[PDB]
Each structure stands twice: as C-alpha cells, then as structure tokens.
Symmetry: D2
Subunit: 125 residues, 4 copies
C-alpha cells in the first residue's frame, strides 16, 4: 500500500471547476478520468500517471504527474496536457500542479505549440 494511496484516490476539483477522478495503485500507478470545464473538451477523457508510493517522512509533499490526450468518443482536440505536482495531505488536502498543454502543429507553427499553466485541486467544490 503506497503511503498516500488512500489520500490521493478519489474525486478532485480544480479552480476552473474541472473534475479529476483518480485511483492510486500500490505500485505507483494513477488511473482515471478527467473532465475539463474549459476548452475544446466535453465529457470524460482517460488519464494515466504515476506517483511516489514511498515519499519522504519529513513533511514534504508527494510528487505525482498525469497525462490526458484530448480525444474521446465526442471530440478530438489534437492535444495533450500533462500535470506535474505534489499532493499535500491533511484536513485541507491539495494537489498543487503546473501543466503543459501541447497541440499538434506544423513544423512552421511548432514554436506556438505549448501552453503552460497551474491548477490547484481540492477534495471539495
């Protein structure tokens, strides 16, 4: 059982009103679904990622990351987002992330392929 397997598993919400549904495996796996409240997206998309299943015991957060490719049965935005961040446990548990959103482009437009931003996920809202 990963140190924060129970803390990470469940339904999370970010500041945009997106919904992150994840299961943390004992082995370090993250699996689930993502629903974006914004952008060229509708309904759920598959996500997969990894987390540190044996984090530091000095009060540090737990490093994790995941990917969504923005293709499902409804839409294809020809793009993928990766979130990189840390889980911080406790009464007001949080996942604090930064993300990179890449779209497929021509070589001439590849300089403009990637958005960067930050999302904070909580168990409420």
């Amino acid at each position: 059982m990963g140190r924060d397997e129970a803390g990470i598993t469940g339904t999370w919400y970010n500041q945009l009103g997106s919904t992150f549904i994840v299961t943390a495996g004992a082995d370090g796996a993250l699996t689930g679904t993502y629903e974006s409240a914004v952008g060229n997206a509708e309904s759920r998309y598959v996500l997969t990622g990894r987390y540190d299943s044996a984090p530091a015991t000095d009060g540090s957060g737990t490093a994790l990351g995941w990917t969504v490719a923005w293709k499902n049965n409804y839409r294809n935005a020809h793009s993928a987002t990766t979130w990189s961040g840390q889980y911080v446990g406790g009464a007001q548990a949080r996942i604090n992330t930064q993300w990179l959103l890449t779209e497929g482009t021509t070589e001439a437009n590849a300089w403009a392929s990637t958005l960067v931003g930050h999302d904070t996920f909580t168990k409420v809202k």
Copy 2:
C-alpha cells in the same frame, strides 16, 4: 490501430543520452520504461502516458505526454517528470517535448519545487 501507433512504438534517445522505451496502444495508451542519463536516477523507471490516436491529416504532429515517478527498486528521488510534446514522423522522426520535474517539498519551499526543460528524442543515438 492508432495512426502513429507503429511510428511511436520503440526505443528513443534524447540529447542527454537518456533512453525512452515505449509501446503505443490502439486506444491511445503509452507504456514503457525510462532510463535517465542524468540526475538522481539509475536503471529503468516505469512510464505511462497518452497520445492522440487519430491526429490531424494536414501535416500536423501527433500530441502526446507521459509521466515517470523517480522511484524504482534502486533509488527514490521523491520526484516526477512529465513530458508534453508532439511526434513528427518521417525519415528523421522526432518527439519534441517540454517537461516539468516536480520534487516533493515542504510548503515553505514549494515555490522552488518544479524544474522546466525541453528534450528532443530521435530513433538514432
């Protein structure tokens, strides 16, 4: 069969001499192993990610991303990297990425939790 399933599957190398071994699934899954030539890393680490299995047919690249958590049987760097980028097929196939490397930190040090960089992967070297 994903449009670039065959193009993406295989062994890739970046400019640091790291080795990315990946299998692309028909469903959009990426699975495999990563070996970093640099940093607090030794041997292989599990990776998982996603790719656009039906990309644009206008000469755009194929969006993809993946995650490594830097824990294996040898070491634990209490960190995770996510790569976000695009696959560009052809004689000199490439995966062009940007990445985010987050370490677990205390809340006081969380401003300094995340490195950013860029890796280019080719099928040779």
Copy 3:
C-alpha cells in the same frame, strides 16, 4: 499616458510576501525594485521590463513582463527570474504571472538550470 500606467505604478505584494515596486512609463517601460521574501536574496534588486501601453478595450488584461538578476551589493545568487503575465484592473487589482528562474550552470548540469512557478500580486498585504 499608457492606458494602465496609473493602475500598474506602485507597490505590489505576492503570496510569498515579496515586494514589487514599479513605475510604468508612457512608452511601455517598467522600472523599479524587487525584494524576495524567499531564496538566496536580501534587500532590493533592480528590475526592468515592458508592458502593453495600449491594451485591448474588450475587458482583456494588459500583458507585461519583467526581469530581476539576483545580484546586489549584499549577495549574488548567479540567477535571474523573469515574470510574464497580465495586469487586471479594478477594485481587487491583480498581476497574474508565471515565472522562469534560471541559474548559471555547467553544461553538464544545464538540464537542471531553470525553475518555473507562478506568483499573484495584489496592492494589499
């Protein structure tokens, strides 16, 4: 007179308790001083940057950016931070930024040269 010259000029504070003192010029210049509450920093450092002196009139924010090199009479952290973001005017005025912090490194360590993060500045606190 830049559209938001008066709105941007003044003393700003971020979520870390750092202090950003800036003058916006009619020509698009930003000049002032930065004092970091965290990291290898003490007292004030010179800053310079630019802003859009004729922003869109459709309720969009005002794009701006600035640089600090972390050398002053007290310390030299051999690093520079750049903030890129937008000014949003009104009762609860804000500057919403993302930043890149580069340290001088050897070529072997250059993959690890750059931190990324996000700061929100307000006129209170």
Copy 4:
C-alpha cells in the same frame, strides 16, 4: 565592466531566424531591440532586461533575462514575452533560453493566456 559585458553585447540570432540586438551595461542592464521572424510581429520592438555582471568563475554560464512587449509603431499583439536563460561564452558562444509568452485575455480565458518555449541564440546565422 561586467565579466561578460563584451561577450553578450551585439547581434544574436535564434533557430527561427529572429534577431536580438543587445547592449550589456557594466551595472547589469540589457537594452536593445528584438525582431521576430514569426507570429504577430513586424520590424523591431524595444527590449530591456538584466544579467549577472559578476558570474561564478567555475565554468558556469551567466544568468540573464529580458522582456519584449509586442507593441511598436506598426502592430500591437497585446502580448509580452520574457526569456530566461544563460550565456555560455567561447568560440561557439550561445544564449540558451526558455520563454513565456503571455497574451492579455478575459478572466474566463486566462487559463490559456501563456505559451512556453525555448530559443537558442548564436552570433552566426
């Protein structure tokens, strides 16, 4: 006289064919003009920034950064780019950077305000 004042001052070119014309001051200032070969840009734009005028003497690079707001007499792209990076001196001198490009947006679109990328500048091409 800054350690790399003479090395940094001059005309630089990146991989897109953009032109960076800069003067490094003894005090740590960068001033000059930028001409982008791509995007919503024409002719020269003002730039300002900072560099470490007393870098480490252990073979590390020299940290620097600069800003362009994409307004000139010809066009206004309501955006600003900041480059953060390091200068590496020698026969094949380089400035290795990462950048953040923010556009002014509405609050509803602010998640999508910022591009990230990387530019390498050389004294030839």
